[PDB]
């Protein structure tokens, strides 16, 4: 609980709480009774009593009894079914016989898991959508804010803050595409009985799965997937990529907050938001190892791999929604310090503009000749500890082709941004 | 090398060998010169000399010099560019000036990586396609081969071998869908220069990227992605799911090969193919942790995360193609032992048919009554160590509703398969 | 909470609960005030008021306020210090000035972490000690219980159950050695102030650390270790090995519980204990990836890596203590089914004794000759579907050297156990 | 091969090459024949022929045949034994019968693995020893070089470069202790035969293992450990900690190389060494997940887990030795830029000395009063954009207790280093 505030996101944590989990299991049991009554497998009468008794089962369920019983049964569904049955019995000893009719523990657990995933995906998707919108808007606001591009953590050539923001925006848009593309394949119901054959429903199996899926508004699958878990992993893999995208952003803005750089700051000096996001960017990759090992499952119901999913999947959702929430706060209240950006550009005293000077000279001199005059000027500028502009401006060959004013233009960071504006426009359009 | 034969797949290993990597880099340099000549940035003359000198550069390149130089430069592209330039020079000192014009090391390395991924994906996709076809065909051949379904490694209720095969087939089909769905987003070119601004190409940047993408037949992206790596991770994540699917299959067939079960065997008694596949199902999840940590990259070119990708991505492809190749061999030459399957069904002496007997009795007796007669019969059958059929057949209540012949039918494994045939038909149709 | 019962161990979970964590932080603050009063840095008077106010601070602390404040400060220590100070103030506005004198957040957090580790290690060590004792005792009880040894999951040659138990016992003993060997190096105090220089204590720093360590009965280190985390990883690495040892045991006993093998059973048929232990054996390796990435920490206090430890370390302890607790239950109430063991030995109808027959014949025949008679007999026995003893006993060359009674001895599983009894005695002695 | 130069270390890579592996296997076979001849199990004559034929077997072995055969057998030992036998046969058809007498594949593979580990550990230990020596020497050289301590990547209070170096030195010393402490437990021989019972050696088993261990100068274990793998994991876990220690150092020196900080540089501006070390600090944690999953092994010889070790263990050694080698180069030729260190200390214009000013005033004013005068001065200094010294020096209360010269002393970074010199001396002594 003390850490929930630091790393997770309140709504996604609630969706995965013990109380919500049991709520979703109740929902799965109700849909099952309804789907069966609707096709004749059980009397409409029983379904109605179950549907009504359910509305308050959550308040009548003993969570201490449930936890203790879980350790002995090996899963929550078994003791949960006992309790729900006893609850429906105290309302009609007869409807009680139809509670959990034909299902096995994993049907209810996997279905509640998919119901949880459906709801937490909606929240995560909306967070990504706001992050995208906000990054696009800031990219536009600062598309002309010049600053240094850094490679291997060393100043290299100028870029604009808007270009970093456009790069992040486009990454969020690819995440939005990934989320939409997996929904149909992944949000499906689970109902197959003990060995996934629906044997106790005899020849009514396919009819009942179809109506069960429909009641919950989930997809239906061709065959039971108690042992094939690609759908679970697939959902985790997309959350993993989203966490990696904001992890990269948090690495960048906290580096820009170093005392000696101070170009961008987290809204109100410690980078508290970066610390949480970077912790999630450490933890999610480790949880991915786990969710992938969980694919190796024995026959019709695994020993170990399936149990591990109950611990890893929720943690991945919670860290991702938590990391997205802190990233949004930062993208919205981000403080840009234009003076420090200008100052850090002056750090190498014009040496970073060397190649720009060389390109301006190439036409009137031949690239070989241009390269040679600039390299000798850099040596001189370093020996005299002067700005490269001061040295190049007193070189004869050069005065032959450029006035002082043309030289001042050649040395402006803005004059060497290549096609950065085309790239920013290109990402503003894919929107 | 000795292990390559055990875990990898020959063609995918070649695509990622030092020699192929340098080949793809050469290909990237040629496309760059051609795209530039085609839009005016460099003389068509130079492009033609480079394109021709390239055809044999691979044979002229010194790989020992290259490896030694790589350790000092920090990447292969830098010493590779020197060498290729020297090679083009000995053919025309003038065309040599245009080699690697405007690109930075990462453009050539990421582009060669995507070219490699394109080729290895084609091979992996074709392996999945054959695995799918073969699983569908075997599923049909054995849709009626009865055997025990096992949960928590304990016999539970009958299923058919064809149902396990249909479950695997449908998993392969979802993999085929995943592979097709990422191609457009992932197989794109990389050309952005030092800080991804294409500054040295000035206002010709967007025009050149477009023609470079086209020359290589790759997609073009809105902005440079030197630091945003979701496309790399995404490709690894799909390979990871495929390896998890065959890992699950290898766990199953090797369990079916245990001396005491002996229901299915690897083609010619050790499960050599399972050992390799299960090793890949251990290694790939670990490599996933690595590829996901690699998303956290500093600014415009990372220190560490990017270097790690060069080691992990190829290993994931190689283990996946290797695991697919051994799985295909097994799916094709799989030996089914129907007698052992029949025998293991007799293992509990009819106790696994208890619920089937109870369902047959429910109508003529009321489920409560049916449950009670069957439970007392199980106790008796265990006490007398007799087959449950022998005990139930001499119970009065029962003889009242069933002749010996109807009892023999109720006890046949085939009579309690629920909707397994509908599920097998459903997966044969999605095809 | 519902899952705590399934995977963790009650006492270790309490040591890592929010309430115990704050308790240990209080303990760290008290020791600090006492150590300082004892060397003159603060008045003995203040230390006494703090020590007394502390006895009930836990009941006066607002945990909701604390959680909310934590999300904003980035760690629990900061809001905790405010609260504890306010608590000491309402008892003496003057002693309150000396609360948390000279320490930084990480000193209190790392010290409370080591106090927690000290207490959970004592519990884990005692669990390993009982597992060791129990395995040694069972090894002795069944040192002569013959059963099949299995390689690549295939029957190979006879072993005894006692030999598997001795192998597990010796592994537990190496764990006991590992635990004892790291205590001195790992259970040390943390007190270094903001940048680990104890600057606000001026020239009293070393004197105060020495007395602080002593008050808590922890080791003292030569230099501050806010950024060097090998001690944390080292503790996790040993817990990781212990979880791997019981993971291996759970894989084995659940395989022995398969319906068709049924040689050993979990005490009261699903392997519920194996499912939990195997889930921990999936999760701990993934958490190890995380704890190892956490070593890469920036300068004097990291951004991300340190925060991640707060989530991973406790989970590793909790899963290990949980896995040990279920393993102990199984080692103590383990049900051995000697008849099934005897029966599975008869599974290949004497074929597994082929090499034993060959060794008995080698002396009177020459190994070449012995190998050739046995191989032809195996072919015949398989063709006639007879026990190998029936075939070999009617082979002339053979009757020439052995009576029927000597042949019956050569075919007893017990006669081909090599030095298994020496190995079991050897592990009973290292005890 | 091209990457070997970037990430690994030449000698450790050779120890794990195919050629060295087969060399060590030959060595294991020779020791086995010798140990057996020495106790009577095989004729001294055969042992001598094998020992002599071995001296050149490596040159006679067909590596292509070996690789092809390996993929079919499932391990290298099987086809290797065939070849070595054929080699010994062409020298004496009789000695050939005793090649690999009584051993199983895993005995030779695990023994060659431990022989490799023994040799690579010697190299890694020596690298750590040199890193330790060099760090201690540099710590001494710069114990007085003042620079900023940084927390959460923000300047905090002064420290000395020597203190960072002492912290690293002490971490290397704990690694030296860890390496020495595991040798006895981990460097042991493996000889147990098919199911670890040495059944084919009958009652000579224990005698032969003892002499086999002795011939190779390895420890002997109480029982066979084909399935218990804690010794392998333990070796990987220590290499993992070493890689994490230099990973932390590489993060620090590359941050100190940022253009705007420029306090320390890699010897000859890109941090090429940091890039490799940080890639190993990403990859090793992932490989740890794998080596830990490999503990879960089936019965007497696993399917999958054991095979995976052949790929992970060597990679961990190679990355660790590679990371150590680059770290040593940097520790030895490290360039310290004292002026930039001095300059970055002036970055906040005295604000970082605020607490030092407050401690100097506390005695003559009361901590409350001191805190209040300093906080108002910081506000003023920020409003006027002046150095805090300029503001505090014109505050009356203050002039009352300090002359200008005493104020200049209070503001020197060196005057607020707490017990850093005691810590540096403490680590120089543990040496």
DSSP, residue by residue, D236-291: HHHHHHHHHHHHHHHHHHHHHTSTTT--EE------HHHHHHHHHHHHHHHHHHHH
| CB count in 10 Å sphere of residue D130 | 17
Three-class SS state of B336: strand
Q: How many CB pairs under 8 A join B and C?
A: 64
Residues followed by a gap in chain C, C→N > 2.5 Å? 268
Per-residue DSSP letter, B219:
B
* Of D5, D70, D311, Cβ closest to residue B71: D5
Q: How many CB pairs under 8 A join C and D?
A: 300
Residues followed by a gap in chain D, C→N > 2.5 Å? 268
* Of C150, C257, C286, Cβ closest to residue B153: C257
> How far is Cα B221 from Cα C328, in angstroms, rounded to an integer?
58
Interface test with B, best of C148, C149, C153 (most B CBs within 10 A): C153
Quote the tokens at residue D391: 């503001």
Contact C258 B261 (CB under 8 A): yes
For residue D100, give every residue at least 6 positions away whose Cβ sits within 8 Å of its Cβ, in sequence order, or none: D29, D32, D81, D84, D85, D108
Which chain B residues are closer than 8 Å to A421 by Cβ? none
Burial B198-229 (b: 16+ CB within 10 A, else e): bbbbbebbbbbbebbbebbebeebbbbbbbbb
For residue C419, give every residue at least 6 positions away whose Cβ sits within 8 Å of its Cβ, in sequence order, or none: D197, D198, D201, D203, D205, D206
Q: How many CB pairs under 8 A join A and D?
A: 64
First to last CA, chain C: 39
Is the Cβ–Cβ distance between B235 and B243 less than 8 Å? Answer: no
D340 to chain A: closest CA residue: A260
The owner of tokens 């001195």 is C184
Interface test with A, best of B136, B179, B251, B295 (most A CBs within 10 A): B295
| CB count in 10 Å sphere of residue A410 | 18
DSSP states of B356-411 as a string?
HHHHHHHHHH-HHHHHHHHHHHHHHHHHHT--HHHHHTT-HHHHTT--HHHHHHHT
Is the Cβ–Cβ distance between C295 and D245 less than 8 Å? Answer: yes
C205 to chain D: closest CA residue: D419
Closest to B238 measured CA to CA, from C293, A221, D311, A182 = A182
> How far is Cα A294 from Cα B244, in angstroms, rounded to an integer?
8
Backbone φ and ψ for C336, nearest 5 degrees, come out as -100, 130
For residue A243, give every residue at least 6 positions away whose Cβ sits within 8 Å of its Cβ, in sequence order, or none: A280, A281, A284, A316, A319, A320, A323
Q: What are the CA-CA distances from residue D410 to residues C152, D414, D417 (Å)?
A: 73, 9, 12
Our CA-based measurement puts residue B255 at a distance from the nearest CA of chain D, in whole angstroms, of: 10
D290 to chain A: closest CA residue: A289
> How far is Cα B289 from Cα B237, in angstroms, rounded to an integer?
10
Residues 218..257 of B with a Cβ closer than 8 Å to C: which?
254-255, 257
A290 to chain D: closest CA residue: D289
Our CA-based measurement puts residue A293 at a distance from the nearest CA of chain D, in whole angstroms, of: 9
Q: Which residues pair with A160 in a beta bridge?
A: A146
CATH topology for C104-346 is: Fumarase C; Chain A, domain 2 (1.20.200)
Residues 118..157 of A with a Cβ closer than 8 Å to B: which?
149-153, 156-157
Residues 317..376 of A with a Cβ closer than 8 Å to B: which?
355-356, 359, 367
- Phi-psi label, residue A173: left if phi above 0, alpha if psi -120 to 50, beta otherwise: alpha
Quote the tokens at residue C216: 């808590």
For residue C178, give every residue at least 6 positions away whose Cβ sits within 8 Å of its Cβ, in sequence order, or none: C238, C241, D234
Is the Cβ–Cβ distance between D329 and D127 less than 8 Å? Answer: no
Backbone φ and ψ for B152, nearest 5 degrees, come out as 55, 30
Q: What architecture does CATH give domain B5-103?
A: Orthogonal Bundle (1.10)
Is the Cβ–Cβ distance between C414 and C425 less than 8 Å? Answer: no
Quote the tokens at residue A328: 């949004």
> How far is Cα A103 from Cα A111, in angstroms, rounded to an integer?
11
Our CA-based measurement puts residue A36 at a distance from the nearest CA of chain C, in whole angstroms, of: 29
Three-class SS state of C164: helix
CATH topology for A348-428 is: Ribonucleotide Reductase Protein R1; domain 1 (1.10.40)
DSSP states of B18-39 as a string?
HHHHHHHHHHHHHHHHHHHHHT
Helix axis angle, C272-293 relative to C305-333, nearest 10°? 160
Contact D347 A259 (CB under 8 A): yes
Domain ranges of chain B: 5-103, 104-346, 348-428
Rg, chain C, Cα only: 31
Interface test with A, best of B197, B225, B240, B287 (most A CBs within 10 A): B197
Report resolution (Å) to 1 decimal: 2.3
> How far is Cα C319 from Cα C279, in angstroms, rounded to an integer?
9
Helix axis angle, B230-256 relative to B105-141, nearest 10°? 30
User: Could you tell me if A104 lies within 8 Å of chain D, comparing CB atoms?
Assistant: no
SS (H, E, C) C129-142: HHHHHHHHHHHHHC
One fold for C104-346 and C348-428: no
Is the Cβ–Cβ distance between C6 and C72 less than 8 Å? Answer: no
Which chain C residues are closer than 8 Å to A67 by Cβ? 1-2, 4-5
Is the Cβ–Cβ distance between D120 and D236 less than 8 Å? Answer: no
| CB count in 10 Å sphere of residue B389 | 18
For residue C281, give every residue at least 6 positions away whose Cβ sits within 8 Å of its Cβ, in sequence order, or none: A304, C243, C244, C246, C247, C248, C250, C251, C323, D293, D295, D296
Q: Which residues pair with D158 in a beta bridge?
A: D148
């Amino acid at each position: 609980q003390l850490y929930a505030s630091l790393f997770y996101q309140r709504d996604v944590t609630e969706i995965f709480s013990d109380r919500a989990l049991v709520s979703y299991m109740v929902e799965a049991e109700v849909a099952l009774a309804q789907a069966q009554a609707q096709v004749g497998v059980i009397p409409q009468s029983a379904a109605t009593v179950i549907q009504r008794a359910a509305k308050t089962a959550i308040d009548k369920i003993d969570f201490d009894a449930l936890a203790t019983a879980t350790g002995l049964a090996g899963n929550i569904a078994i003791p949960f079914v006992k309790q729900l049955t006893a609850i429906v019995k105290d309302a009609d000893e007869d409807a009680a016989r139809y509670v959990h009719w034909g299902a096995t523990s994993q049907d209810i657990l996997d279905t509640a898991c998919i119901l949880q995933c459906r709801d937490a995906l909606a929240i995560v998707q909306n967070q990504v959508q706001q992050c995208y919108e906000t990054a696009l808007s800031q990219a536009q606001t600062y598309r002309h804010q010049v600053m240094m591009g850094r490679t291997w953590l060393q100043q290299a050539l100028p870029i604009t803050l808007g270009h970093k923001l456009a790069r992040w925006a486009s990454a969020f848009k690819r995440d939005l595409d990934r989320i939409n593309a997996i929904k149909a394949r992944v949000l499906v119901a689970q109902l197959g009985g003990a060995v996934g054959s629906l044997a106790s429903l005899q020849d009514q199996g396919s009819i009942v799965v179809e109506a069960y899926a429909k009641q919950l508004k989930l997809g239906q699958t061709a065959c039971t997937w108690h042992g094939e878990r690609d759908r679970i992993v697939e959902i985790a893999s997309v959350l993993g990529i989203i966490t990696g995208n904001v992890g990269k952003m948090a690495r960048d803005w906290s580096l820009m907050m170093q005392t000696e750089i101070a170009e961008v700051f987290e809204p109100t000096r410690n980078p508290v938001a970066a610390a949480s996001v970077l912790a999630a960017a450490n933890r999610v990759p480790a949880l991915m190892s786990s969710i992938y090992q969980s694919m190796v499952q024995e026959h019709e119901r695994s020993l170990g791999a399936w149990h591990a999913e109950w611990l890893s999947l929720p943690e991945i959702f919670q860290l991702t929604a938590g990391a997205l929430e802190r990233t949004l706060d930062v993208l919205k209240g981000m403080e840009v310090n234009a003076e420090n950006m200008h100052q850090n550009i002056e750090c190498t005293h014009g040496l970073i503009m060397a190649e720009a000077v060389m390109m301006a000279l190439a036409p009137h001199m031949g690239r070989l000749n241009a390269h040679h005059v600039v390299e000798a000027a850099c040596k001189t500028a370093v020996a005299e500890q002067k700005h490269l502009k001061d040295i190049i401006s007193q070189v004869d060959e050069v005065k032959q082709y450029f006035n002082p004013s043309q030289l001042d233009e050649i040395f402006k960071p803005e004059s060497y941004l290549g096609n950065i504006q085309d790239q920013i426009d290109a990402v503003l359009q894919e929107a």
